[PDB]
Amino acid sequence: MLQPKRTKFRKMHKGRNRGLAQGTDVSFGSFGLKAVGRGRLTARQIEAARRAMTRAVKRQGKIWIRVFPDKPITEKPLAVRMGKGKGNVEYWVALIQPGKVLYEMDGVPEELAREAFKLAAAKLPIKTTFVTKTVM
Amino acid sequence: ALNLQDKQAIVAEVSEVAKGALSAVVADSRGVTVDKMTELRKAGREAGVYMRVVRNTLLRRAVEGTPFECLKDAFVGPTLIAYSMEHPGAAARLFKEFAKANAKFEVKAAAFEGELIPASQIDRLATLPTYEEAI
Amino acid sequence: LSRRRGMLKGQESEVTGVKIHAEVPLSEMFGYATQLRSLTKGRASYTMEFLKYDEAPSNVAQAVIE
Amino acid sequence: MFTINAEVRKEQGKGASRRLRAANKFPAIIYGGKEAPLAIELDHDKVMNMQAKAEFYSEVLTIVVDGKEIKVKAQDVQRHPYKPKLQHIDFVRA
Amino acid sequence: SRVAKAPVVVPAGVDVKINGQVITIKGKNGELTRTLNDAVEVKHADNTLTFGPRDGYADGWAQAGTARALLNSMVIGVTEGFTKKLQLVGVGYRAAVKGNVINLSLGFSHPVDHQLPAGITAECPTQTEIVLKGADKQVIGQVAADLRAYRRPEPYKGKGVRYADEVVRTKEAKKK
Amino acid sequence: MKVRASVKKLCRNCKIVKRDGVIRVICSAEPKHKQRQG
Amino acid sequence: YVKLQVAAGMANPSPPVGPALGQQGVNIMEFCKAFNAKTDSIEKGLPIPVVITVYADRSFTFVTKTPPAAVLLKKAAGIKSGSGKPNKDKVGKISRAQLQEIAQTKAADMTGADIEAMTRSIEGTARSMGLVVE
RNA sequence: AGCCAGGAUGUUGGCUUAGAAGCAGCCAUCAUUUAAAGAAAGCGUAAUAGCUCACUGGUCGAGUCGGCCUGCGCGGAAGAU
Ligand SMILES: [Mg+2]
Ligand SMILES: [Mg+2]
Ligand SMILES: [Zn+2]
C-alpha cells in the first residue's frame, strides 16, 4: 500500500485532471502497461494490480511501478451535514493522464509479459494498453 | 525461396540419383505401418536400394530429366519411387515379397529402362539374375 | 483415500484384486465401511490398525478446544 | 537503402499540423549544416512501417523533395502519447 | 458460395418440373416438391442442374448453396432411399409396428403410439432396433428425432433410444 | 448452461455461435462449458 | 495379448508375475521355466522387457527385448540413480569406448544401420540422464 | 476446408512419487528412422491401456490465412396506476 512517508500538508484541493501525461516512453524495463484513459489510481488498486502480475510472472524478472499515490483524498463521515471544515483523509490516489506508463517489467518473455499485464489491467479502473521499449 | 527453394533442392538429389541408378520401381504404400515400412527400408539398404516418397508433382519434373519419361506417365496416388542401383532388381524382388506379406502394398508401375512394365509383368525383373555370373 | 488425506504407501496387486496400504487419521476414518461399499458395490473390504502419530493441521487443532 | 518521399509544407502552425495528421500525413523538419531548415510533410503509414524496423535510426535516410535527394539521419521522434502514431520527426543532414 | 458452383447431375429415369421457384422431382422411390427461395435462380442444363444468385439480393450465394443441398437431397431421396437405425437400450424396452404406427414400451405406465407421416415406413427386424425408410431427409430426420425424444438416452447407463451411428457419452457415479 | 456477460471458449472443443442475436458457446465435449450471453 | 519387464532369473518369484497371468488365465509354471531358460542364459538380475503375447485362443508366445538403455548406461557408469539436474549436477562418468558395446547389444532394437548413429542415439539418452561423457 | 493413409524407434528421457509409462510437478531437451512424427498441444487412465492433435503423403482444383487502424451495429440492460 504505497503512501508518502511524510507530507508538507495533510489535505489538498480537489484540483483537476486535464492534459496529457509525462513519462510516455518505456524507460527502465522492456515492456509496459500504458494508460489510455484518465482517472485516479488508488493505492489499493495499484498494489492489487502489482500482486496480480507478480504472481503471474512467478517471481521472474524485474517490475517497476512508475506511479505513486501522493494526492490525499478526504471523505466526510456518514450522516454528517455540509460544512464544518474539510473531511478526514481516507485514501491516497495518483492522478493519471492518457499516455502514462503505469507499470514496467523486464527479464520475462514478451508472451508472458502480455498475460501478466492483462491480469494486472483487469484490476485497474481505467483503460490500458501494452507497449514495448522503442529506440528513438 | 523458402519451401520453393526447398523443392528446388529436393528435386536435385532425386534427379541425380535417377541418373546414377540402374532400375526403377514405383509402388503404392497406403495403409502400411511405419514399423513395417522401417523393416522394408532396412532390407532395401542392406541390398543397395534407395526408396523415397515425394510429391507426385515434384517427381514428374524430377524424372523428366531421367530416362524413364515413360514411367512419368501415370504417377497417380501414393508413390514410393525405388532406385535399384547395384544389382538391377533388388528393389523389385523386395517389393513383391512385401506385397504378399503386407496387403495394400500395391506394386503398380515399374521401369525396365524405357519400357513400362505393369503390375502383371513385374516377374521379369523379380526373377533376373545377379550381374557377376561370367565365371 | 486422498479426500481422506491419507498418504498412500502401496498398491500391491493380487490374483484376486488389489491391496492398497495407506496411513489415514483415525478421526477422519470414522464411518468408512459404508462409503467403501458404496464405491465398490459392497465388493471390497478393509483392515485398519493404529500405526503412528503425526501433527494435526492447524484448522483441526484450532477446532479442538476444551 | 531507406528512401522516403516528402513535400514542402505550405503552412506551418498547430491548426495546419492537425489538418495534416487528420489527412493521414504528418510533418517533419530537416536541419543541420549550412543549409536553412526545411519543413516537410510526409505520409504517415509508410514511415510507420519503415520505423517499425530498428535499423530506421541507424542507417542514412534519403528524402526526396522536389525531385531531389537529401541524405539525413533520424534525430528525434515525437510519438502520439498512447496511440501508435508519429507526431513529428527531426532529421539532421548527413 | 462454392458448393453452389458444383452442379447437381440428375440421373436417368428422374423428371424435373420447374415453375419458377417451385420445383417437383419424381423417381423410382417417390415424389417430392419444394418451393425455393426467391433469391436463387435454378437452371435445368443439359441433363444437370445449375444454381446461381439472382440480381438484387444480398443473400444470394448462401441461398443458392442451401438450395443445391436441398435439391441434391431430393434427388438422392427419389433415386435411392434414406434410412435411419434406432437402437433401444434397457431391460424391458421394445418396439413394434402395425402399419405406419410404432408402438413402444419405454418403461412407462402407458404404451407409446407414434403415427408416422405420409412417406415414411418403419420396420423392426428385432425387438430392440428400428429401421426407418423414407425419401425426405428432413422428414425422416425429424421422425428419428421424435423417436429419440420419447426417451432420450440416459447418461449413467445409456438406457433409452439412441441412433446406431450415435455414440452415447456415459458417466460415472460415486454414490456420495 | 451458464448465463454470463462474458462468454468465452473454455477449451478447443468450445464453439461460439450467434443464434438469435444472442451469443452461445456450445461444447461437444463438456456440458459444463455451455454458455449464453445474458 | 500383454507385455512385461520381469527381471532376469526372477520368473520363479511371482510378485506381479502371478497376478498378471492370473487374470489372463495362464499357467505360471510353464511361462516360468521358459522365461527362466533365457533369463539364466543371460546376466541374471536385470530388468528385461518381454512381449508376452498370449492369443486369447489359449495361446502362449513371448518375445524378450534387450535390457533398457537406462539400466545399461547406469550400470556401465556404476550408478544406481539418475541426474536430478541433468544440466547442473551431471554426475556419473561414461566412456565413448563404453558406448560401442551397449550399442552392439541394442543394435537389434533400433532401425539405423550405422553403428555411430546408434552410439549418437544412446549418448543422446546419456545427456538426458545426465552422464559425464567424454 | 473436407475425405483416405501414416503419426514411429532407443524410450516407460531423468528426478521425485504408492503410481508419474508424452500429458501431477521439477531439469533438460536429444539423437535414430524418415515424407513426417513434439522427449508432446489435448482428452482419457491410480498407473497402464485407449481416443486425438501438431507434422507428412494421397485425393480435391481456386484462391486462402491471420494480425493492425477505423465507421456503424449486438449482449451486458430488472419496478411498481
Ligand atoms: Mg485552435
Ligand atoms: Mg496422467
Ligand atoms: Zn469445451
UniProtKB/Swiss-Prot annotation, chain C:
**Similarity field:** Belongs to the TRAFAC class translation factor GTPase superfamily. Classic translation factor GTPase family. EF-G/EF-2 subfamily.
Function recorded in the entry: Catalyzes the GTP-dependent ribosomal translocation step during translation elongation. During this step, the ribosome changes from the pre-translocational (PRE) to the post-translocational (POST) state as the newly formed A-site-bound peptidyl-tRNA and P-site-bound deacylated tRNA move to the P and E sites, respectively. Catalyzes the coordinated movement of the two tRNA molecules, the mRNA and conformational changes in the ribosome.
Sites of N6-acetyllysine modification: 9
Supply the name of the protein: Elongation factor G
Q: Where in the cell is it found?
A: Cytoplasm
Report which part of the complete sequence is shown: 635 to 700 of 704
Swiss-Prot record, chain D:
Q: Which GO terms describe its molecular function?
A: 5S rRNA binding; structural constituent of ribosome
* Ribosomal protein among keywords: yes
Entry's Gene Ontology BP terms: cytoplasmic translation; negative regulation of translation; response to radiation; ribosomal large subunit assembly; translation
Q: Which UniProt keywords apply?
A: Ribonucleoprotein, Ribosomal protein, RNA-binding, rRNA-binding
Gene Ontology cellular-component terms listed:
cytoplasm; cytosol; cytosolic large ribosomal subunit
Residue spans crossing the bilayer: none
Q: What domain of life is recorded for the organism?
A: Bacteria
* InterPro entries, per the entry: Rbsml_bL25/Gln-tRNA_synth_N (IPR020056), Ribosomal_bL25/Gln-tRNA_synth (IPR011035), Ribosomal_bL25_short (IPR020055), Ribosomal_L25_dom (IPR029751), Ribosomal_uL5_bac-type (IPR020930)
Asked whether the keyword Hydrolase is assigned, the reply is: no
Family stated for the protein in its record? Belongs to the bacterial ribosomal protein bL25 family.
Q: How does it assemble?
A: Part of the 50S ribosomal subunit; part of the 5S rRNA/L5/L18/L25 subcomplex. Contacts the 5S rRNA.
Main function: This is one of the proteins that binds to the 5S RNA in the ribosome where it forms part of the central protuberance. Binds to the 5S rRNA independently of L5 and L18. Not required for binding of the 5S rRNA/L5/L18 subcomplex to 23S rRNA.
Protein's name according to its UniProt entry: Large ribosomal subunit protein bL25
Q: Which organism is it from?
A: Escherichia coli (strain K12)
Name the encoding gene, please: rplY
Curated annotation (Swiss-Prot), chain E:
- What InterPro entries does the annotation carry? Ribosomal_uL6-like, Ribosomal_uL6-like_a/b-dom_sf, Ribosomal_uL6_a/b-dom, Ribosomal_uL6_bac-type, Ribosomal_uL6_CS
Q: Which PROSITE patterns match?
A: RIBOSOMAL_L6_1 (PS00525)
**SUPFAM superfamilies reported for this sequence:** Ribosomal protein L6
- Give the record's GO biological process terms: cytoplasmic translation; response to antibiotic; ribosomal large subunit assembly
Query: Molecular function (GO) terms listed?
Result: large ribosomal subunit rRNA binding; structural constituent of ribosome
A GO-annotated cellular component: cytoplasm
In the record, which positions carry N6-acetyllysine? 43
Which Gene3D superfamilies does the annotation name?
A: Ribosomal protein L6, alpha-beta domain
Q: Which UniProt keywords apply?
A: Acetylation, Antibiotic resistance, Ribonucleoprotein, Ribosomal protein, RNA-binding, rRNA-binding
Quaternary structure, from the entry: Part of the 50S ribosomal subunit.
The entry assigns this protein to a family as follows: Belongs to the universal ribosomal protein uL6 family.
Q: Outline what the protein does.
A: This protein binds directly to at least 2 domains of the 23S ribosomal RNA, thus is important in its secondary structure. It is located near the subunit interface in the base of the L7/L12 stalk, and near the tRNA binding site of the peptidyltransferase center. Gentamicin-resistant mutations in this protein affect translation fidelity.
Q: What is this protein called?
A: Large ribosomal subunit protein uL6
Q: Which organism is it from?
A: Escherichia coli (strain K12)
Swiss-Prot record, chain G:
As for what it does, the entry says: Forms part of the ribosomal stalk which helps the ribosome interact with GTP-bound translation factors.
Q: Family per UniProt?
A: Belongs to the universal ribosomal protein uL11 family.
Q: What is this protein called?
A: Large ribosomal subunit protein uL11
Q: Which GO terms describe its biological process?
A: cytoplasmic translation; ribosomal large subunit assembly; stringent response; translation; translational termination
Q: Which keywords does this chain's UniProt record carry?
A: Methylation, Ribonucleoprotein, Ribosomal protein, RNA-binding, rRNA-binding
Q: Which InterPro entries match?
A: Ribosomal_uL11, Ribosomal_uL11_bac-typ, Ribosomal_uL11_C, Ribosomal_uL11_C_sf, Ribosomal_uL11_CS, Ribosomal_uL11_N, Ribosomal_uL11_N_sf
Gene symbol?
rplK
The PTM N6,N6,N6-trimethyllysine maps to 33
Q: Does the keyword rRNA-binding apply?
A: yes
One Pfam family name is Ribosomal_L11_N
Q: List the SMART domains hit by this protein, alphabetically.
A: RL11 (SM00649)
Subunit structure of this chain's protein: Part of the ribosomal stalk of the 50S ribosomal subunit. Interacts with L10 and the large rRNA to form the base of the stalk. L10 forms an elongated spine to which 2 L12 dimers bind in a sequential fashion forming a pentameric L10(L12)2(L12)2 complex.
Q: Which organism is it from?
A: Escherichia coli (strain K12)
Gene Ontology terms: cellular component: cytoplasm; cytosol; cytosolic large ribosomal subunit
According to the UniProt record, list the residues that bear N6-succinyllysine: 65, 74
Gene Ontology molecular function: any one: large ribosomal subunit rRNA binding
